[PDB]
Amino acid sequence: KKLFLVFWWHMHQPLYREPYTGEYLLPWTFFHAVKDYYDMPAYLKDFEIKLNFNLTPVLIDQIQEYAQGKAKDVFLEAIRKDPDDLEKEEVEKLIEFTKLNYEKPIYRFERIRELMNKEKLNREELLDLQTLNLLAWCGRTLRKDLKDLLNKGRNYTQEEKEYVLNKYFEIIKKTLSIYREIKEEGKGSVSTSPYYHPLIPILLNPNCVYETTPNVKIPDFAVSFREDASKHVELAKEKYFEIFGEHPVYMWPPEASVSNEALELYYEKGINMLATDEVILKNSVERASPYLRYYFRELISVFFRDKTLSDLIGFSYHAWNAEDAVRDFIGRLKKIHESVDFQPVVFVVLDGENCWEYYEENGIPFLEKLYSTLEKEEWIETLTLEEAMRKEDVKTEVIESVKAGTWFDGNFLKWIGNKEKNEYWKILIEAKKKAKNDYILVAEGSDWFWWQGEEKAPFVEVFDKLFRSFVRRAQE
Numbered sequence: 362k363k364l365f366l367v368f369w370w371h372m373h374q375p376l377y378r379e380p381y382t383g384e385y386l387l388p389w390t391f392f393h394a395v396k397d398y399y400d401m402p403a404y405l406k407d408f409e410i411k412l413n414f415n416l417t418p419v420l421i422d423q424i425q426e427y428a429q430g431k432a433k434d435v436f437l438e439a440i441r442k443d444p445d446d447l448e449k450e451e452v453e454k455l456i457e458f459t460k461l462n463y464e465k466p467i468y469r470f471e472r473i474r475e476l477m478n479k480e481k482l483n484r485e486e487l488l489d490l491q492t493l494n495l496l497a498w499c500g501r502t503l504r505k506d507l508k509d510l511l512n513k514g515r516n517y518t519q520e521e522k523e524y525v526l527n528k529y530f531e532i533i534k535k536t537l538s539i540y541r542e543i544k545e546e547g548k549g550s551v552s553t554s555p556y557y558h559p560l561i562p563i564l565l566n567p568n569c570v571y572e573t574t575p576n577v578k579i580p581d582f583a584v585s586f587r588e589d590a591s592k593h594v595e596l597a598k599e600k601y602f603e604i605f606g607e608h609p610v611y612m613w614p615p616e617a618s619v620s621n622e623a624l625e626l627y628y629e630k631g632i633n634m635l636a637t638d639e640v641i642l643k644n645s646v647e648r649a650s651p652y653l654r655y656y657f658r659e660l661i662s663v664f665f666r667d668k669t670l671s672d673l674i675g676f677s678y679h680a681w682n683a684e685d686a687v688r689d690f691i692g693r694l695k696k697i698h699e700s701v702d703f704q705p706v707v708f709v710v711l712d713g714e715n716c717w718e719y720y721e722e723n724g725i726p727f728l729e730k731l732y733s734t735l736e737k738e739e740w741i742e743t744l745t746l747e748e749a750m751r752k753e754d755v756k757t758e759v760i761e762s763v764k765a766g767t768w769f770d771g772n773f774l775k776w777i778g779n780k781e782k783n784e785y786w787k788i789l790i791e792a793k794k795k796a797k798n799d800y801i802l803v804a805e806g807s808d809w810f811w812w813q814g815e816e817k818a819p820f821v822e823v824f825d826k827l828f829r830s831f832v833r834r835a836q837e
């Protein structure tokens with residue numbers, strides 16, 4: 362009797378490319394590309410387990426633009442320049458970026474502490490600040506390759522910075538290829554999401570928020586977004602086909618968000634399986650285990666993620682010693698294994714790139730220990746999404762209705778409901794009446810609403826500039 366374990370790492374960035382200038386106004390796609398988007402599937406070269414990935418199409422577009430050398434990334438320009446060529450504003454942006462990231466474990470360089478405690482920085486000090494900002498985001502692969510430059514910790518030259526930059530772009534250029542490789546070799550399945558990561562249930566029916574939060578205030582949705590909901594899914598199928606040569610049959614619904622209408626749309630668009638959150642299951646069925654494969658109306662397969670296990674990795678284990686965390690995770694799997702006489706399917710689904718910066722050494726000790734341990738546990742079998750979809754020796758249940766929600770509290774309050782978020786929806790509703798191109802789809806991304814107030818929102822003014830620029834561009 363096995364326990365089936367299914368990792369599904371979700372990779373996404375909203376579009377940071379300002380549509381009038383073409384400038385990438387934040388570097389987060391670059392930094393997560395060099396730190397996480399190649400390195401997470403690259404573990405499959407070293408560990409004989411299965412790991413699955415979601416790539417949003419908008420993320421794929423940006424990875425391609427960086428790989429082609431076309432991304433005009435303003436922060437990265439300030440890193441690349443000789444410090445004698447830095448504008449005053451670029452020095453300020455470099456220091457502010459450092460300050461925002463200063464307390465993260467991946468920024469724990471003695472030299473960063475020295476530089477941030479100095480009233481003025483000279484050219485050699487600025488070179489160190491530029492190069493250490495780059496190296497703080499070094500991924501697993503290059504942390505071995507560049508180990509000697511990493512252990513320097515200071516006294517970097519322009520030549521060394523450019524060498525690091527060159528290696529980083531090498532990583533980006535081979536990133537889509539590694540997803541094709543691990544997919545073709547059967548080491549993982551790759552899914553995608555509706556194109557710009559929108560909240561499909563709200564686009565289909567804004568009143569679905571009242572299935573969970575009767576007291577929420579929403580704006581007057583005086584225009585239909587239902588056709589846009591279909592377009593996000595259709596365009597995503599085509600982008601996926603461009604990369605992989607096939608239409609996707611698995612999708613990750615953004616924010617785990619489902620509704621009866623959203624599930625019908627995914628079925629109509631040929632999606633065979635998705636996953637969502639355990640809280641949705643609890644809200645929808647009186648008594649139901651997340652270790653079964655579910656069939657929504659016999660139309661589409663649904664797995665409900667194990668929220669506890671997923672949140673332990675995504676939010677808890679950065680605060681743990683790595684060996685202890687792996688022992689805790691395996692011991693929880695052992696308890697699940699011993700708790701049922703059938704073979705449970707355990708979905709661990711979470712963002713694939715956001716938790717690691719808070720772990721010791723970027724989560725590399727934790728993941729290496731976790732994966733090394735898993736590959737040797739005879740009673741655990743990790744599965745691709747395809748294997749999980751088709752596994753016969755598993756328990757199964759038909760479900761007829763879900764209560765609309767997300768993986769954040771089972772409801773939509775992170776994206777709608779307060780004055781500031783509602784103002785964004787009002788702006789979008791009015792723009793949609795006048796919309797002339799697909800930039801309206803960009804503005805439907807969940808990210809813009811996530812950050813709109815909110816007191817914890819790094820660079821929130823940039824997200825606001827982007828959202829409003831996409832809204833304006835959509836009407837021209």
Ligand SMILES: OC[C@H]1O[C@H](O[C@H]2[C@H](O)[C@@H](O)[C@@H](O[C@H]3[C@H](O)[C@@H](O)[C@@H](O)O[C@@H]3CO)O[C@@H]2CO)[C@H](O)[C@@H](O)[C@@H]1O
Binds near residue numbers: 375389715807809819
């Ligand atoms: O400056 C704020 C913030 O920006 C960047 O965060 C991005 C994440 O890295 C990226 O994965 C994505 O995050 C969303 C997840 O995909 C999604 O599943 C859910 O968890 O919501 C997230 C927010 O929408 O997008 C955000 C930006 O929207 C940057 O990496 C952070 O360090 C930085 O704090």
